[PDB]
Amino acid sequence: PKLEGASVPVMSTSYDVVVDREFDELLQGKDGLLVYHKMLSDGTVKNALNYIFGRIRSAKWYVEPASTDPEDIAIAAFIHAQLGIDDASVGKYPFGRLFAIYENAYIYGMAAGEIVLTLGADGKLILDKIVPIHPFNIDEVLYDEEGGPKALKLSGEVKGGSQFVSGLEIPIWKTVVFLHNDDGSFTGQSALRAAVPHWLAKRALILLINHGLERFMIGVPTLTIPKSVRQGTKQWEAAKEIVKNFVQKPRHGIILPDDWKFDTVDLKSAMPDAIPYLTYHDAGIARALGIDFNTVQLNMGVQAINIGEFVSLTQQTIISLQREFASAVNLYLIPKLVLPNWPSATRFPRLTFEMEERNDFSAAANLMGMLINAVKDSEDIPTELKALIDALPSKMRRALGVVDEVREAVRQP
Amino acid sequence: TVKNALNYIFGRIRSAKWYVEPASTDPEDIAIAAFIHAQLGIDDASVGKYPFGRLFAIYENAYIYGMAAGEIVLTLGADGKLILDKIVPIHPFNIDEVLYDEEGGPKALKLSGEVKGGSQFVSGLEIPIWKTVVFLHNDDGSFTGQSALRAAVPHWLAKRALILLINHGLERFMIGVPTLTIPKSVRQGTKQWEAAKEIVKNFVQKPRHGIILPDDWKFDTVDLKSAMPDAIPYLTYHDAGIARALGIDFNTVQLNMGVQAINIGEFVSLTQQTIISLQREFASAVNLYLIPKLVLPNWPSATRFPRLTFEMEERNDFSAAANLMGMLINAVKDSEDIPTELKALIDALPSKMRRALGVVDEVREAVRQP
Amino acid sequence: EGASVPVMSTSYDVVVDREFDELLQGKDGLLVYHKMLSDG
Amino acid sequence: KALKLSGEVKGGSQFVSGLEIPIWKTVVFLHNDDGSFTGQSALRAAVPHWLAK
């Protein structure tokens, strides 16, 4: 008596004017990718990405085992060594390449890498390299009859210009795929999508301000002459010179016959101060990414006392990005490193990170001191200490940090 | 502003320190809860096993649109138990209707949409409720969900209309509206008419060009009679009102800028009351639709179920709670078995004191026994 | 066996090898950045 | 595989033209490599503000 499979296929997020999550024509195709690429040249976008991408990488990445069983510890230790998990999250070369690919998926909606294995020095199959696949070079995702992804179809120029590759198909099981903000249909979306209106408004507004500034700074010179003066006279040339010189040589000064009148246009108000409106839109670029402190004003001006709370609010956005990254690693990469070496493996180690929400360090370090004090008189302080830690209620245990049993197994010489 | 608010709310929901509570302290309920803990991959960061994050994404669609669902697919696992294979997400754009029995209870979802990749159109596919997890947002008891964004619509519309009006206002006050008064002699298609149009055009486009006029032509800009009204506070009233309408109790547009309340943390605490309600709505669906589906095929006479739950995060009491934890450790430090004596003492504490320390997770302890 | 996908250029439409802006392409681009070093 | 180099030797003794050096003889630093082995100046996004200033 065998179990039923899925009766519902994966379906596109499509209704009426919305086709595969998108209503806007200009952001729809691969032509939409050109908009997001152009956004990377904006200083506010780049500032936000530097912060977000840096914070994600700094999240104290480690490997948790599928269980506390000796065998799951050993498998997890192997993955730990493959990535070069360390205190700064520097790692072995391919680890940083995975974040770079994920950054492309954040910007564009989706990116991928080909996983290449090689024979290790001890007989195991090990990660050789990750070949990055850019969304500029993805034609389409190919699907099975249930709407599950099966392959990527690629077209692009081989770097160095040796040849054009046309419709190369790569099976999904040879890849890690990163999707940003998947709604369940297997369609990624650029994180910059909600920032486009503010970005456009910021640009239009800089153009408007620059033009306003000219007229209010210089003045628009007017010269009224007798209707007897006509074009191509020496009189006319003199009128032209006066107007030109007012703009270019303000020190020259103006000598007029008494029937010629010079004035600048009366704008009849002071220049409108458009700076707060500009910064509303400019700062709104970073708000649209889920950043909860003002990235344009930064430390300047009267503000909330407690800026750290706003950094903590921002962590809720960034921590979701870390889970999105970890999820793809855990689904696409780790099983593909384990199964060649352990073919009957049913459960897998997981890449994970330390939750950084609030600064509770001073309180937690004081608790740590109290724990040590308690098992001080002990014969084996490290063992008593760790036993005591694992007995603690969740909030207390987590505030100290991770007791990394996988790291322990890796570091045993 | 919508996207900013959703990033915060959905991030905080997922960060709630999700765990599994057993139906009772009985050994068997602990064992069943441990099985559920292992299915989801419950861990300190709430990363989890693949389908765990998939449940949240479905719930997010329900928050945005009112309703979403997933098909629960089971498979035979390594040790003989029926385990969770996958959750197939069902988007509201592809739900035709909910089908009901004669008592008005839900019996099935009827679905229509294009299979991803465009291989075929699926038409009127019926899925029994017992094969699904259904997420409704803000169910009033009639089994009708409602978008969380409903009360934000008027502010969102107002914000958009105001940006347009401000943009329009800014041009006339920035540039000016040029006027040129000329003799009634001048007619269209004169050299003179061309020069008139050029003056007006160049005033807009080339203010440095300057203007030479016969003494019977007068140039001016329109007198607007006063300075441009400052519409920014009204705009931000409506804009920030979008996030207010979701139950966020700090200003998401101004953020850290401007003179403010000293205690921003209190407003983050107020906001938690909204977000904690969303966590219970999510937990409720998992506890009703998913957990019993995973338990019953393995324990067919199970009458009581483990529950997905979370740590209440309302206030920051950590310094005081950590100090209490130290006082407790110090009182049992002379014990031959500090771990056992500590947990015994913690369970005996009055409720406020006990909860502030965190969860003594006996399901986790069972799971971690090698 | 090794890779079945080559490393490809980040090119599509007016974007050639990551750049759309003529004035910042090639070694002429490097002159702009060099000039920027004399800004305080 | 290689860098192809051209420039004047410091002191002006000769012009070097199309000299090829294999990558295994070098350390290469790229800034903000997107996976294509193309670096990009950190100053790219600062250009509009610099011009405006």
Question: What is the per-residue DSSP string for A283-308?
Answer: HHHHHTTT--S-TTTTT-SSB-S-HH
Identity at A157, one-letter amino acid code: E
- CA separation for the pair B366, B123 (Å, rounded): 47
Identity at B140, one-letter amino acid code: D
- CA separation for the pair B85, B294 (Å, rounded): 11
Closest CA to A274 of A185, A207, A365: A207
* Chain D closest-CA separation from residue A132 CA (Å): 5
Q: How far is CA A286 from CA A48, A272, A317, in A?
A: 6, 25, 12
Residues 209-238, chain B, touching A (beta carbon < 8 A) = 210-217, 219-221, 223-224, 226-228, 232, 235-236
Subunit contact C9:D43, Cβ cutoff 8 A: no
Physical contact, C and B (3 or more Cβ pairs within 8 A): no
Grouping H, G, I as helix, E, B as strand and the rest as coil, residue B274 is: helix
Residues with Cβ within 8 Å of residue B142, at least 6 apart in sequence: B104
Chains near D with 3+ CB pairs less than 8 A apart are A, C
Identity at D16, one-letter amino acid code: V
* Chain D closest-CA separation from residue C30 CA (Å): 9
Under a CB-based contact definition with an 8 Å cutoff, are residues B5 and B252 in contact? yes
What are residue B89's DSSP bridge partners?
B70
Residues with Cβ within 8 Å of residue D35, at least 6 apart in sequence: A97, A100, A101, A104, A111, A113, A132, A133, A134, C7, C10
Question: Which tokens hold the place of B197?
Answer: 């149009």
Q: CA angle at residue A97 from B46 to A100, to 5 degrees?
A: 75
- Please provide residue A36's backbone torsions phi and psi, each rounded to the nearest 5 degrees: -65, -40
- Is D37 an 8 Å CB contact of chain C? yes
Residue in the block written with tokens 């498979």 = B75
Classify each residue of A45-67 as buried b or exposed e, where b means 16 or more C-beta atoms within 10 Å of its C-beta.
bbbbbebbbebbbebebbbbbbb
Closest CA to A195 of A316, A315, A45, A18: A45
- Residue of D36, D43, D50 lying closest to C8 (CB–CB): D36
Subunit contact A97:D35, Cβ cutoff 8 A: yes
Strand order in the sheet with A110-119: A125-133, A110-119, A175-179
Closest CA to B13 of B285, B227, B221: B285
- CA separation for the pair A339, A115 (Å, rounded): 14
- Is D43 an 8 Å CB contact of chain A? no
Chains near B with 3+ CB pairs less than 8 A apart are A
Question: Which tokens hold the place of B327?
Answer: 């006082």
In angstroms and rounded to an integer, the radius of gyration of the C-alpha atoms of chain C is 16
Chain A nearest-CA residue for C2: A116
- Is C3 an 8 Å CB contact of chain D? no
- Is A197 an 8 Å CB contact of chain D? no
- Is C14 an 8 Å CB contact of chain A? yes
Residue B92 has what DSSP assignment? G
- CA separation for the pair A8, A6 (Å, rounded): 6
- Residue of D37, D41, D43 lying closest to C7 (CB–CB): D37
Residue B297 has what DSSP assignment? T
- Is A290 an 8 Å CB contact of chain B? yes
Identity at A382, one-letter amino acid code: P
- CA separation for the pair A169, B351 (Å, rounded): 60
- CA separation for the pair B231, B239 (Å, rounded): 12
Residue B257 has what DSSP assignment? B
Grouping H, G, I as helix, E, B as strand and the rest as coil, residue B88 is: strand
Which helix (H) or strand (E) covers residue A321, if one does? Answer: helix A307-328
- Please provide residue B104's backbone torsions phi and psi, each rounded to the nearest 5 degrees: 70, 20
The region, left, alpha or beta by phi > 0 then psi within -120 to 50, assigned to residue A261 is beta
Subunit contact A114:C5, Cβ cutoff 8 A: yes
Resolution (Å) of this entry? 2.0
Closest CA to B210 of A222, A231, A261: A222
Residue in the block written with tokens 């699907």 = A143
Physical contact, B and A (3 or more Cβ pairs within 8 A): yes
- CA separation for the pair B223, A56 (Å, rounded): 54
Chain D nearest-CA residue for C10: D36
Chains near C with 3+ CB pairs less than 8 A apart are A, D
End-to-end CA distance of chain D: 41
Subunit contact D44:C36, Cβ cutoff 8 A: no
What technique determined this structure? Answer: X-ray
- CA separation for the pair A322, A350 (Å, rounded): 13
Cα–chain center distance at B312:
18
D8 CB-side CA count, 13 A: 4
Cα–chain center distance at A319:
12
Identity at B307, one-letter amino acid code: R
Subunit contact B316:A358, Cβ cutoff 8 A: yes
Subunit contact A269:B57, Cβ cutoff 8 A: no
- Residue of D34, D37, D52 lying closest to A104 (CB–CB): D34
Closest CA to B111 of B130, B91, B131: B91
- CA separation for the pair D13, B59 (Å, rounded): 71
Subunit contact D36:C17, Cβ cutoff 8 A: yes
Classify each residue of B32-49 as buried b or exposed e, where b means 16 or more C-beta atoms within 10 Å of its C-beta.
bbbbbbbbbbbbbbbbbb
Residues 87-106, chain B, touching A (beta carbon < 8 A) = 88-91, 93-94
Q: CA angle at residue B73 from A331 to A153, to 5 degrees?
A: 45
DSSP per residue, B173-221? HHT--EEEE--TT--TTSHHHHHHHHHHHHHHH-TTS-EEEETT-EEEE
